[PDB]
Amino acid sequence: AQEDNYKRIVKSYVGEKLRKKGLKIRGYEGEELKPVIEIAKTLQRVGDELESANTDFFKNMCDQLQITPSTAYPTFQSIADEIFVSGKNWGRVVAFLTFGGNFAVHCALRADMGEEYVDRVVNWISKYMAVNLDYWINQQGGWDGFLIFFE
Amino acid sequence: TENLGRVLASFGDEINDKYRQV
Amino acid sequence: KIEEGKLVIWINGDKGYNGLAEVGKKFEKDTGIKVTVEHPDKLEEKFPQVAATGDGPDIIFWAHDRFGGYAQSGLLAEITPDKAFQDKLYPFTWDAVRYNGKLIAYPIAVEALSLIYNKDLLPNPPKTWEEIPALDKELKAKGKSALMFNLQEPYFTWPLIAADGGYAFKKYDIKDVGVDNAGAKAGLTFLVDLIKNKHMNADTDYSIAEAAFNKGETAMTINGPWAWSNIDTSKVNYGVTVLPTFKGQPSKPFVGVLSAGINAASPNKELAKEFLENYLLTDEGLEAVNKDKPLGAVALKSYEEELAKDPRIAATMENAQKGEIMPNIPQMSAFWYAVRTAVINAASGRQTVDEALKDAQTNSS
Ligand SMILES: OC[C@H]1O[C@H](O[C@H]2[C@H](O)[C@@H](O)[C@@H](O[C@H]3[C@H](O)[C@@H](O)[C@@H](O)O[C@@H]3CO)O[C@@H]2CO)[C@H](O)[C@@H](O)[C@@H]1O
């Protein structure tokens, strides 16, 4: 329900990243999404700003996590919790989505992790927002507020 | 993992500080 | 087998392993982590064997009394819940799984034996052990028996043994064992005399006593909450009440805390913590297991409140309060093994009550 609402946004964000890198994942073959895309456009724009200002971090993120099938989900939960442990703001929501996107596109497609982890991570990201972030987000006006805040 | 999430939250703060119109 | 990215769970065959699997199903649906739940025989004896070689399950369920031995063998990972999750379970349940200053398992539920009786055959259950023989003689004349319960596992006979002064240990003094004191002999002797007077049979085991009661062939049985499911299915109009007194003293069942320990050799330790804290130890998680086989009084404060209304749980608590929580020290396995031999030999007439308990006093060290 609400988890689905977030997955729609996360799916499109990850799908564009997948296609830039050149991958062709099942379920992310294309963007038929068409006013909701305005959320996608803002997320890609400000998401790309944050990683282009900290390139070396995201370039080497997977090498430090050394994710395996045993540690992928616990590592995701632990890092996400630590992003918001001392508070929430729209900027941190973005940081969390850029972490997730890079987590699904790069670390999830390493040799020891198959394509099946792309959709799993997207689900982890979506469930996390619906369970842990939905209250604050609707406090700040939902996605409409997200849009106004980043222009 | 611990400090990775803390570094990401600082990255998010830098972005929030920029767009802050307040 | 423990591969990466999967959870193998062991839990005894009398608990709700099917209901635990549907918690595992919900876990896989969200995480993609497949959960396999197994209920192999002698689960508690095999775990130290296969875990010692770095094999076995990721998660082992058993009463807390066995985990101290596992812990000192280095087979269990320290569990480190944050304050928010630790506050969700009762502190005394956490105490049951603390060993040498370590939390070594997650507590699940408190288990206490109670007297289960057939109201159709026995409207008023007996208040004392002493009046059961006379009760059996009335029921035998009508083709029934008064009581059948598992005599092959000392767990079911300890309440009577401890009633008049029997105890296991004594912080915990391993030299002070109360297995062959006057109170223990008086309890075991009453059991033996019941068999000699043909009010029970030494070879009665768990399955025999369950079938006998759930088929309406005996008026009373001694069992825990896990057994209520099958009684419901049998439609026997049953009740759960305080155990019979012995020599004016309440029966004192040894109280167990069903606990989940994490294999120290598992590569899935963090995955096990996610599953246990966030899927099993929730209201929805425990309900799934409880709906399969009742757990007793669960360690989760929120869900324990919801079930406390159940009179069967209340009766379980009464017997629990009149009992004593089992120690978790490693010496508990030797104590059980010792007392298992003494009950079987005394019941079957291979040893007298005295030489049976003396050997147990010695073997309990
Ligand atoms: O009997 C089934 C019923 O009793 C359980 O209690 C047992 C203890 O939890 C357990 O430690 C047991 O000790 C046994 C050893 O651990 C085991 O290796 C076995 O081989 O020898 C001992 C028994 O002879 O002591 C009792 C059983 O005597 C448990 O609380 C219940 O949940 C379980 O359903």
Cβ partners under 8 Å of residue C300, min gap 6 = C88, C89, C281, C282, C283, C286
**Chains B and C share 3 or more Cβ pairs within 8 Å:** no
- Mutation target to probe the C interface, by most C beta carbons within 10 A, among A3, A4, A70, A71 is A70
Strands C145-147, C114-118: parallel, antiparallel or unpaired by DSSP? unpaired
CB C57 within 8 A of CB C10: yes
Structural domains of chain C, with CATH? 6-111+256-325 (3.40.190.10), 114-252+331-363 (3.40.190.10)
Place of tokens 């099942």: A26
Task: Give chain C's largest Cα–Cα span.
Answer: 62
How far is the C-alpha of A125 from the C-alpha of A149, rounded, in Å?
Answer: 22
- Search chain A and give the residue with CA nearest B19: A150
H helix intervals, chain A: 2-21, 37-52, 55-59, 61-65, 72-84, 90-105, 116-128, 134-139, 142-149
CB contact under 8 A, B9 and A49: no
How far is the C-alpha of C124 from the C-alpha of C119, rounded, in Å?
Answer: 7
Residue by residue, DSSP assigns C280-321 as: ISSHHHHHHHHHHS--SEESBHHHHHHHTT-HHHHHHHHHHH
For this entry, resolution in Å reads: 2.2
Tokens of C145: 């028996």
How far is the C-alpha of C351 from the C-alpha of C80, rounded, in Å?
Answer: 47
CB A109 within 8 A of CB A117: yes
CB C142 within 8 A of CB C257: no
3-state secondary structure of C154: helix
CB contact under 8 A, C274 and A117: no
| CA distance readout (Å), C69 to A94, C64, C73, C134 | 48, 10, 6, 43
Q: What is the DSSP letter of C74?
A: T
Tokens of A76: 């995701």
Element (H, E) at C275: helix C269-275
Beta strands in chain C (DSSP E): 6-10, 34-38, 59-63, 98-99, 102-103, 106-111, 114-118, 145-147, 167-169, 177-178, 218-223, 238-241, 254-262, 297-298, 324-325
**Chains C and A share 3 or more Cβ pairs within 8 Å:** yes
Place of tokens 């209250």: A135
Tokens of C214: 């759930």
